[PDB]
């Protein structure tokens, strides 16, 4: 949480996209549209 420690090699936030839940919300949204 420091300005000089901004570009840490292992920062505390990690992306985690659960690809099964992403395809089901695309496909219903392509059904209504």
């Amino acid at each position: 949480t420091e300005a000089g420690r901004f570009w840490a090699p292992h920062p505390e936030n990690v992306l985690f996209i659960h690809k099964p839940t992403m395809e089901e919300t695309r496909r219903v949204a392509l059904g209504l549209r």
């Binding site: 949480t1 420091e2 300005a3 000089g4």
Partner: protein, 83 residues
């Protein structure tokens, strides 16, 4: 001072007969100018021993250029504690 601080002898050129420049680590934090969150305690304390940072920057005009080429660690001779 709390009579046991650590010291530094900064040296540029003998201009006077005998005048010397000494740097406590609270004082060298003021010439640095880093962000407050790196040292969240001493910034309040070192801000009341001195001004906004130009009271000591008047004596060394080269503090922009001494940081670029990197000669500042060659000009400090560690001395020790106070007596």
């Amino acid at each position: 001072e709390p009579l046991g601080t650590f010291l530094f002898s900064f040296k540029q050129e003998d201009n006077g007969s005998s005048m010397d420049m000494l740097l406590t680590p609270t004082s060298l934090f003021m010439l640095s100018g880093m962000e407050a969150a790196k040292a969240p305690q001493t910034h309040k304390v070192a801000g009341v021993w001195y001004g906004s940072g130009s009271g000591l920057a008047d004596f060394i005009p080269n503090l922009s250029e001494l940081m670029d080429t990197g000669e500042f660690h060659t000009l400090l001779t560690p001395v020790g504690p106070m007596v």
